[PDB]
Motif scaffolding. Structure first.
Motif, short mmCIF file in Angstrom:
data_model
loop_
_atom_site.label_atom_id
_atom_site.label_comp_id
_atom_site.label_asym_id
_atom_site.label_seq_id
_atom_site.Cartn_x
_atom_site.Cartn_y
_atom_site.Cartn_z
N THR A 1 0.79 -1.25 0.00
CA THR A 1 0.00 0.00 0.00
C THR A 1 0.82 1.28 0.00
OG1 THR A 1 -0.33 -0.07 2.40
CG2 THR A 1 -2.06 -1.11 1.02
N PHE A 2 1.88 1.37 0.82
CA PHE A 2 2.69 2.60 0.83
C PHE A 2 3.37 2.80 -0.52
CE2 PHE A 2 2.62 1.24 5.37
CZ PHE A 2 1.82 2.25 5.86
N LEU B 1 -19.49 -6.90 1.65
CA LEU B 1 -19.20 -7.51 2.96
C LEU B 1 -17.74 -7.29 3.41
CD1 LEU B 1 -20.19 -9.39 5.32
CD2 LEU B 1 -19.48 -11.33 3.85
N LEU B 2 -16.82 -7.08 2.44
CA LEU B 2 -15.41 -6.86 2.73
C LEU B 2 -14.99 -5.39 2.58
CD1 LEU B 2 -14.20 -10.05 0.74
CD2 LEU B 2 -15.07 -9.92 3.06
N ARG C 1 -14.76 -2.88 4.74
CA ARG C 1 -13.84 -2.40 5.80
C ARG C 1 -12.36 -2.67 5.39
NH1 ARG C 1 -18.28 -2.90 9.34
NH2 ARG C 1 -18.35 -5.02 8.52
N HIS C 2 -12.09 -3.81 4.72
CA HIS C 2 -10.74 -4.16 4.24
C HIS C 2 -10.26 -3.16 3.19
CE1 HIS C 2 -7.91 -7.64 2.76
NE2 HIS C 2 -7.25 -6.49 2.89
N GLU D 1 -9.41 0.15 5.08
CA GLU D 1 -8.21 0.01 5.90
C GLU D 1 -6.96 0.08 4.99
OE1 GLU D 1 -9.00 -3.53 8.52
OE2 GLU D 1 -8.86 -2.01 10.10
N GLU D 2 -6.99 -0.54 3.79
CA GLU D 2 -5.85 -0.46 2.87
C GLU D 2 -5.67 0.95 2.34
OE1 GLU D 2 -5.31 -3.63 -0.04
OE2 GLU D 2 -5.24 -5.14 1.55
N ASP E 1 -3.63 3.22 4.60
CA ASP E 1 -2.17 3.01 4.42
C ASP E 1 -1.70 3.23 2.98
OD1 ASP E 1 -1.75 2.49 7.11
OD2 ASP E 1 -1.95 0.31 6.89
N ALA F 1 -26.57 -5.27 12.34
CA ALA F 1 -26.02 -4.16 13.13
C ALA F 1 -24.50 -3.99 12.93
CB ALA F 1 -26.31 -4.36 14.60
N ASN F 2 -23.77 -5.07 12.63
CA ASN F 2 -22.33 -4.98 12.41
C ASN F 2 -21.89 -4.86 10.94
OD1 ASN F 2 -21.63 -5.26 15.25
ND2 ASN F 2 -22.21 -7.39 15.09
N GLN G 1 -18.14 1.70 9.62
CA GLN G 1 -18.20 2.73 10.66
C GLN G 1 -17.40 3.98 10.24
OE1 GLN G 1 -17.38 -0.55 11.15
NE2 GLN G 1 -18.82 -1.32 12.67
N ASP H 1 -15.06 5.56 11.73
CA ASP H 1 -13.64 5.37 12.05
C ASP H 1 -12.77 4.99 10.83
OD1 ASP H 1 -15.53 4.10 14.29
OD2 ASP H 1 -13.84 5.00 15.34
N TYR H 2 -13.36 4.35 9.80
CA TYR H 2 -12.60 3.87 8.63
C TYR H 2 -12.29 4.94 7.58
CZ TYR H 2 -13.16 -0.57 10.82
OH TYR H 2 -13.14 -1.56 11.78
#
Ligand SMILES: Nc1nc2c(c(=O)[nH]1)N[C@H]1C(S)=C(S)[C@@H](COP(=O)(O)OP(=O)(O)OC[C@H]3O[C@@H](n4cnc5c(=O)[nH]c(N)nc54)[C@H](O)[C@@H]3O)O[C@H]1N2
Ligand SMILES: Nc1nc2c(c(=O)[nH]1)N[C@H]1C(S)=C(S)[C@@H](COP(=O)(O)OP(=O)(O)OC[C@H]3O[C@@H](n4cnc5c(=O)[nH]c(N)nc54)[C@H](O)[C@@H]3O)O[C@H]1N2
Ligand code: SF4
Ligand code: SF4
Ligand code: SF4
Ligand SMILES: [Ca+2]
Ligand SMILES: [K+]
Ligand SMILES: [K+]
Ligand SMILES: [K+]
Ligand SMILES: [K+]
Ligand SMILES: [Mg+2]
Ligand code: NA
Ligand code: NA
Ligand code: NA
Ligand SMILES: [S]
Ligand SMILES: [W+6]
Ligand SMILES: [Zn+2]
Ligand SMILES: [Zn+2]
Lengths: 431, 269, 569, 130, 81
Positions: free
Chosen positions: C97-98, C120-121, C123-124, C127-128, C131, C549-550, C554, C556-557
């Protein structure tokens, strides 16, 4: 009494996200839906030590110190080391794991997680031959053949069978009655007791059995009358059950990663699953152990390009399991210091590795008393992920789920501890 | 011309010295050779910090003979990617000896660690003691391994010798443990001693010869009969051998395993 | 903060500037009319000044990308680096990623889009992206094989499908309706595929043509900034040009209606080189790129990207699960797959495109014919479906091939297999792209079709100060003869500004700010929205492996959330 | 007698590690050797009697219990933990992963006591490093 | 008479019985699909504090499905008096 719903369990790779926590005056006093293991993690057992303060070993006795003093001494060790090992990670969240990767680059360390004593052989195999997987919902909704090969989910992933096998899915509305359950294990485990077919093979001969199954799948004769204690006729019949699946799933565990052949046992199982796709839809899922072992390997891979056993001694990342894994560095006496986070190598590494831990400085970022803290020079206690701290975790088939903060703790999170350690290591490297 | 490296005390944190090869020593004075960089864990150090250096320089690598006059049990990557000349080690070596070498010769008088001759292209490696795992193997994830050269181990070796081999020759005069020739595509492996299990596992081509006993074998192989006084890539092997073709777990497999009749009656169907 | 980029030759196709010597003034992240005398000077005399590059289709963040990274340690051993002042990284075809963010910034790119995100993925993917330094970005959730989409569109319920898409774009923090092998990847859930646009998947009984038309209507009802983004059925098969042309006509009578931006096309077709094959088998295979290019020239509802072959050892990774399995069945190389419950599928296989082999040679020529036979560069984007046809670090080589018929003929007459000459018309094409046309296909077409051209892809007043300076003098360089100097200059920018701050200087990264995450914010009728949400939650309780609910991503991402409005009440 | 040592999880060892590795319940769950009743008759022992386990790699004292999950003939089971890790094969075969399962061991009855968790770890002789 | 009896001291809290039960599955779509209940519901038994816990014994039809689903004999059908 308050009930907190949709909580994520911080124990195994099943990563159940339907937990209900019973909370009374900032304490988790009970649960609903969590299995016996998950419940044991959530609630406090009377008499168990939960450290309130950092500790340093003096002369057999330990003394309580501040976070500043403990982190200062831990930083001095990492800064002065020529081959520091930073191990564990699988029982913390992804943000703390990412700070770990940055700290390993700063210290010129080797960073490694529990994959090196677990599904690391599956990682070596998937790198050579591939990785044909699916998510849990595809198993629940489509699978008519379910295989547990060298795993005992009733004892190790206790709600896995109820969620994936007994569950009624979209195209498998009869649940357990719509699936053929196969278990491959030398013991008559509690998981094998539920199977339609139990292949009670000879230990350490999975590779030999899989060679016979693959040759048979490709239309060839099996050379011997019995393979791994299974008669030729029964091997041919097992292959026909797999070929007749509408959707098959191969779940596998430590029975084939730890036993004779290690990564080559996984390699041959993966190739069989791939070749089965010429007859029937087939996939596999490694039964990943800790609730966030998967997250470490995801984070480490996306940041460095490699999943585990990552060496930053030369600046650029390098990868060589068998040379740069935790057990290799300890048993070959190459590591001159070890930082442990959210893991227990004291309990779970072989005697030859423990002999090296007795001779080098050991830092343990750990909340409870364990065999590792008995071997530690510095103990730094954190707030526990999934109970007192939030962050991402990855399920065994790669599904990311955010862990929740249910109650409050006065302790620092792992992420906070690691950020302060990174700042102090930089200060010692400079001076 | 001979250049002598006399090791000082080897450190507990291993050294990585891929610059110890005739290609780097060529055209350098003795004083320049002492300044060659090597790794000592997470620090870069000078060759002179861990070795005394003496002898006569030479301009071409084919005219250089490096003599390591002592034990270098904790020194990795000696002779890595060398193209000509010679290295003689009067003692043991750690991992990656001659990894990726294209020509010349390396003699190790003692033992060698894992990955001796990993990704070899040409030349010769001779180990008078024992070798570790992955003699003449590929690198993690790569399907293209050793493509040429000869490796001879006079003692024993461990697992996965010739892993993903695609040419060249490996001779083990002693015994091996499990999975020699795993995923082999081409080349020749001769084991003069015994095998515990899984010789030629998942092989697609090449030849494996076992003169001793194979304790266990694989059901994916087809038995072709007994052949006597066999010849494989110019190597003449007298005596009777059981001949097998496989591994038929692999599509289009054409690999051959020869096993001496005298001690492998239990392997023949 | 104030900057003035002095005396450079400006190329800004959206504002009609074709190599004029002029100054660009910058204040606090934006291009402005003028700055004070205390402004810092960036001397661009004898250099090219362009807007920051905008990549509309790359595989850079998420699950399938990280399987490619994890299962290819040999790809990392071949190219491992430690950036001065920065992070360590590795991977020739699938970079970490960097390294991804650094390599885009080094070639003057400031925005890049993640082409295929499984909901469904999600958040992944985010997150990448956290970075991934410097670049602004967005992610395209997948809809072409989604169970809710297939069941709502089967009944013609485009209003309910629009409410589901509104919820899903917000829940995944996504930007586009991406369609990959519509109905086929669901059919791959049982080991099959679909053949042509009139073949339904098992059970769902909806054709690819009905999925394409219904999703194009949903897209314009939601007034999304970008159009539907389509990877056709029958990828990589001789004779697939007919399926492709039929697919292109499916949404042609739907009128574009973006709320944000200036998009005026209803269909975006990606990596069209893989969809332009003639013949019936590999025994009578011919390029049909001239028929595809003729369709694009004559129609006003379509923008394409090429998917240019770079002739490297690379990695394939797509949400086209059955195509990836078929590729593994042809080359025998390591195969990864991931079927995602109720949503999509994916596969990863390494692939070697050798210049000396016959199919790669024709595939290279097909892409060249698409760039060179399409008259108007406003209908084209430069891509390599990175890393599928080659890694994005090869965009400068693609530019050099387009600007030089000498570079093309040196390859054609040299190593390239004779099939490039016998099975295509590439050797008869002498057209050379100009610097203005290169700027059009690398930042103007993409920014406009993505709905971002108010702030991206141009150097006009009001643009975000995303600027690339290349060490090329257009008054003295001959791009036809000096093709290696063109390639080298576009690979290492002399200066790059991201939001008005210097991030690259002489090809080296000097700052690593976090980029923004663009995503689409839509609001539909409260009554239909409530009804769809009750249905979605009921299907989660029964058939998903997680709790409702999950599921949503969110806050935060996304550290720099940049919402873009579609339809509002 | 010579037997094959298998190691791994039990639900009870799981409950004990999460309750506390410093509690008596961890010794009761992990300092044990599961065996078939026929093997207990061969050795002349009963449930609760102690057994000395010796391998090429080390030695340990554990408590015998009857296996509720039947074992193949000649196999025994010690749950994962520091008692099991005194005797299993440390070598990784250049993979990083030790051989935790299916190791040949010698087992005999003993009157020696099982060591608690802190006492067992003293066999390694940790020397303070600060 | 024959009735449902739990042995929580033998129970793993695996949830096989909770999911397999047709009464529980009919009353809770989450349970029908393999999850533990989140919505408030009245079912026969649930896993609570890590073990099976019988909540509404009068709803049990004594079919034996839960019994076949438990490999450790922690839920049984036996004479209650
Ligand atoms: N209770 C509990 N649960 C846990 C953990 C824990 O410590 N305690 N830790 C977690 C972790 S980190 C992990 S990795 C998982 C692991 O969970 P599993 O993969 O289920 O691991 P094990 O129980 O170690 O071993 C599984 C089975 O392999 C069998 N086996 C032994 N030799 C062979 C062989 O030659 N062939 C075959 N086919 N099988 C063989 C054993 O008899 C055993 O039943 O558990 C997780 N869950
Ligand atoms: N003989 C034998 N040995 C084995 C095995 C076997 O089958 N047989 N299995 C092997 C395998 S697969 C594995 S993974 C290992 C077991 O892997 P380990 O990591 O050794 O397992 P645990 O004992 O669960 O250690 C997890 C630690 O994390 C701590 N912890 C929990 N939450 C947090 C948190 O939020 N932050 C921090 N910092 N710490 C936290 C816990 O208190 C606990 O001490 O054992 C290995 N060893
Ligand atoms: S199965 Fe694993 S994740 Fe689920 S409740 Fe039990 S321990 Fe927690
Ligand atoms: S009674 Fe049996 S099936 Fe039900 S939760 Fe307990 S162990 Fe699982
Ligand atoms: S006996 Fe039948 S009705 Fe009663 S709890 Fe068991 S499964 Fe449900
Ligand atoms: Ca390899
Ligand atoms: K606890
Ligand atoms: K990689
Ligand atoms: K138009
Ligand atoms: K039962
Ligand atoms: Mg799917
Ligand atoms: Na799709
Ligand atoms: Na040519
Ligand atoms: Na027995
Ligand atoms: S693990
Ligand atoms: W594990
Ligand atoms: Zn595509
Ligand atoms: Zn794509």
């Amino acid at each position: 009494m308050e009930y907190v719903k949709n909580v994520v369990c911080p124990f195994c790779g099943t990563l159940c996200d339907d937990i209900i926590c019973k909370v009374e005056g900032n304490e988790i006093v009970g649960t609903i839906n969590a299995c016996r293991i998950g419940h044991s993690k959530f609630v406090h057992a009377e008499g168990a030590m939960r450290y309130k303060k950092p500790l340093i070993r003096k002369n057999g006795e330990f003394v309580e110190v501040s976070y500043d003093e403990a982190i200062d001494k831990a930083a001095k060790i990492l800064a002065e080391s020529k081959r520091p090992l930073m191990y564990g990670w699988s029982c913390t969240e992804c943000e703390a794991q990412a700070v770990g990767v940055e700290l390993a680059e700063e210290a010129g360390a080797v960073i490694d997680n529990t994959a090196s004593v677990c599904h690391g052989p599956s990682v070596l195999a998937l790198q050579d031959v591939g990785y044909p997987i699916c998510t849990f919902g595809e198993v629940k909704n489509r699978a008519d053949v379910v295989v547990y090969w060298g795993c005992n989910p009733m004892h190790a992933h206790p709600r896995h069978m109820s969620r994936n096998v007994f569950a009624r899915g979209f195209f498998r509305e009869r649940g357990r009655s719509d699936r053929t359950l196969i278990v491959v294990d030398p013991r008559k485990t509690d998981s094998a007791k539920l199977a339609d077919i139990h292949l009670q093979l000879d230990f350490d001969r999975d590779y030999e059995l899989l060679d016979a199954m693959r040759a048979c799948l490709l239309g060839h004769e099996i050379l011997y009358d019995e393979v791994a204690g299974v008669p030729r006729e029964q091997i041919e019949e097992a292959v026909e059950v797999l070929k007749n699946a509408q959707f098959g799933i191969l779940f596998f565990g430590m029975g084939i990663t730890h036993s004779r052949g290690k990564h080559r046992n996984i390699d041959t199982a993966i190739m069989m699953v791939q070749d089965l796709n010429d007859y029937a839809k087939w996939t596999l899922i490694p039964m990943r152990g800790h609730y966030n072992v998967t997250g470490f390997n995801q984070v480490c891979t996306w940041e460095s390009g490699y999943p585990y056993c990552v060496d930053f001694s030369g600046g650029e990342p390098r990868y060589n399991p068998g040379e740069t894994g935790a057990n290799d560095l300890l048993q070959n006496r190459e590591a001159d210091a070890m930082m442990v986070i959210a893991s227990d190598p004291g309990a779970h590494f072989p005697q030859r590795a423990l002999e090296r831990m007795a001779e080098i400085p050991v830092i343990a970022i750990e909340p409870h008393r364990t065999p590792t803290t008995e071997m530690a020079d510095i103990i730094i206690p954190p707030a526990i992920v999934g109970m007192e701290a939030e962050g991402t975790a990855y399920r065994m088939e790669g599904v990311p789920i955010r862990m929740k903060k249910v109650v409050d703790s006065d302790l620092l999170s792992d992420r906070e501890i690691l950020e302060r350690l990174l700042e102090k290591v930089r200060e010692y490297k400079a001076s | 011309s001979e250049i002598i490296l006399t090791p000082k005390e080897q450190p507990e944190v291993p050294l990585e010295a891929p610059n110890i090869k005739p290609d780097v020593f060529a055209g350098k004075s003795i004083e320049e050779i002492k300044n060659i960089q090597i790794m000592h864990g997470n620090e870069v150090v000078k060759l002179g910090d861990f070795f005394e250096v003496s002898g006569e320089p030479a301009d071409a690598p084919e005219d250089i003979k490096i003599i390591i006059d002592g034990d270098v049990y904790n020194t990795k990557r000696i002779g890595q990617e060398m193209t000509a000349g010679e290295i003689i080690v009067r003692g043991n070596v750690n991992m990656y000896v001659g990894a990726g070498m294209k020509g010349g010769k390396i003699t190790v008088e003692g033992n060698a660690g894992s990955w001796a001759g990993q990704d070899m292209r040409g030349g010769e490696i001779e180990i008078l003691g024992d070798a570790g795992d992955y003699v003449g193997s590929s690198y993690r994830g790569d399907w293209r391994g050793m493509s040429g050269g000869t490796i001879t181990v006079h003692g024993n070796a461990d697992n996965e010798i010739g892993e993903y081999m695609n040419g060249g020759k490996i001779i083990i005069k002693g015994d091996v443990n499990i999975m020699p020739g795993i995923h082999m595509n081409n080349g020749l492996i001769i084991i003069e001693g015994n095998v515990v299990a899984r010789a030629g596992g998942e092989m697609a081509g090449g030849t494996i010869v076992v003169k001793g006993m194979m304790q266990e074998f694989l059901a994916g192989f087809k038995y072709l009969g007994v052949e006597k006084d066999i010849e494989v890539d110019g190597e003449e092997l007298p005596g009777a051998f059981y001949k097998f073709e496989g591994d038929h777990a692999i599509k289009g497999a054409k690999g051959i395993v020869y096993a001496a009749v005298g001690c492998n009656g239990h392997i023949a169907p | 903060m104030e900057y003035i980029i002095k005396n450079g030759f400006v190329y800004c196709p959206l504002n009609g500037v074709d190599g004029e010597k002029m100054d660009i003034c910058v204040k606090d992240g934006k291009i402005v009319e003028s700055v004070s005398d205390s402004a810092k000077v960036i001397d661009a005399s004898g250099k090219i000044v362009m807007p920051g590059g905008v990549d509309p289709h790359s595989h850079i963040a998420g699950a399938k990308v990280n399987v490619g990274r994890m299962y290819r340690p040999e790809d990392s051993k071949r190219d491992a680096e430690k950036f001065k002042g920065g992070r360590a990284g590795s991977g020739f075809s699938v970079p970490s990623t960097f390294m991804t963010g650094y390599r885009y910034a080094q070639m003057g790119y400031t925005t890049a889009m993640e082409a295929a995100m499984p909901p469904l993925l999600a958040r992944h993917t985010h997150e990448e992206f956290h970075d991934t330094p410097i670049i602004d970005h967005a992610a395209y959730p997948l809809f072409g094989n989604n169970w809710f989409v297939m069941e709502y569109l089967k009944e013609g319920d485009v209003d309910a499908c629009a409410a589901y898409a509104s919820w899903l774009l917000r829940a995944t923090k996504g930007y586009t309706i991406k369609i990959v092998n519509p109905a086929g990847t669901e059919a791959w859930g049982w080991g099959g595929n679909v053949h042509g646009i009139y073949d339904p998947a098992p059970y769902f009984d909806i054709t690819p043509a009905e999925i394409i038309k219904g999703l194009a209507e949903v897209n314009e009802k939601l007034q999304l900034p970008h159009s539907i983004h389509l990877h056709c059925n029958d990828l990589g098969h001789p004779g697939n040009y007919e399926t492709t042309l039929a697919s292109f006509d499916v949404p042609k009578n739907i009128k574009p209606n973006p709320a944000t931006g200036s998009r005026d096309t209803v269909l975006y077709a990606t990596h069209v080189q893989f969809h332009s094959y003639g013949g019936t088998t590999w025994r009578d295979f011919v390029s049909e790129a001239p028929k595809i290019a003729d369709y694009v020239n004559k129609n006003d509802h379509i923008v394409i990207d090429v998917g240019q072959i770079t002739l490297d050892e690379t990695t394939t990774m797509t949400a086209d699960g059955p195509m990836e399995y078929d590729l593994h069945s042809l080359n025998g190389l390591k195969w990864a797959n991931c079927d995602v419950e109720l949503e999509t599928g994916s596969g990863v296989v390494p692939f070697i495109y050798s210049a000396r082999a016959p199919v790669p040679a024709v595939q290279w020529a097909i892409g060249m014919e698409l760039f060179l036979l399409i008259d108007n560069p406003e209908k084209v984007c430069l891509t390599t479906d990175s890393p599928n046809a080659g890694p994005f670090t090869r965009y400068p080589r693609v530019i050099a091939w387009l600007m030089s018929n000498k570079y093309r003929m040196n390859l054609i007459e040299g190593e390239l297999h004779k099939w490039a000459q016998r099975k295509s018309t590439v050797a008869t094409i002498d057209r050379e792209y100009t610097f203005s046309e290169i700027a059009q296909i690398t930042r103007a077409t993409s920014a406009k079709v993505l709905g971002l051209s108010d702030t991206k892809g141009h150097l006009g007043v009001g643009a975000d100060a995303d600027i690339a300076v290349y060490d090329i003098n257009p008054e003295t360089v001959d791009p036809s003869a000096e093709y290696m100097a063109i390639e080298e200059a576009f690979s290492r920018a002399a200066c790059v500004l991201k939001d008005g701050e210097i991030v690259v200087k002489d090809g080296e990264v000097v700052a690593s700010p976090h980029g923004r995450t663009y995503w689409v914010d839509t609001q539909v009728d409260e009554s239909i929205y409530s009804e769809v949400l009750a249905n979605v939650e009921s299907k989660f309780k029964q058939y998903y492996s997680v709790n409702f609910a999950n599921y949503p991503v969110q806050d935060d991402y996304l550290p720099k959330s940049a919402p873009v409005k579609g339809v509002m009440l | 007698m010579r037997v094959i040592l298998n190691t791994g999880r039990t639900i009870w060892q799981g409950q004990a590690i999460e309750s506390g590795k410093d509690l008596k319940m961890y010794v009761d769950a992990a300092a044990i050797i599961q065996m078939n009743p026929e093997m207990m008759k061969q050795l002349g022992i009963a449930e609760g009697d102690n057994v000395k386990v010796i391998s090429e790699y080390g030695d340990v004292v554990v408590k015998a219990v009857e296996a509720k999950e039947p074992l193949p003939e000649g196999m025994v089971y010690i749950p994962m933990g520091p008692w099991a890790n005194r005797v299993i094969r440390p070598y990784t075969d250049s993979t990083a992963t030790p051989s935790f399962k299916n190791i040949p061991v010698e087992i005999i009855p003993t009157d020696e006591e099982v060591l608690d968790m802190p006492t067992l770890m003293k066999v390694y002789g940790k020397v303070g490093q600060i | 008479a024959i009735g449902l009896k739990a042995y929580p001291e033998l129970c793993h809290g695996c949830g096989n019985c909770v999911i397999a039960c047709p009464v529980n599955a009919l009353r809770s779509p989450e349970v029908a699909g393999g999850k533990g209940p989140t919505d408030d519901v009245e079912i026969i038994m649930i896993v609570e504090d890590g073990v099976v816990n019988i909540k509404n014994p009068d709803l049990c039809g004594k079919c034996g499905t839960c019994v076949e689903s438990c490999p450790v004999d922690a839920i049984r059908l036996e004479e209650l008096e």
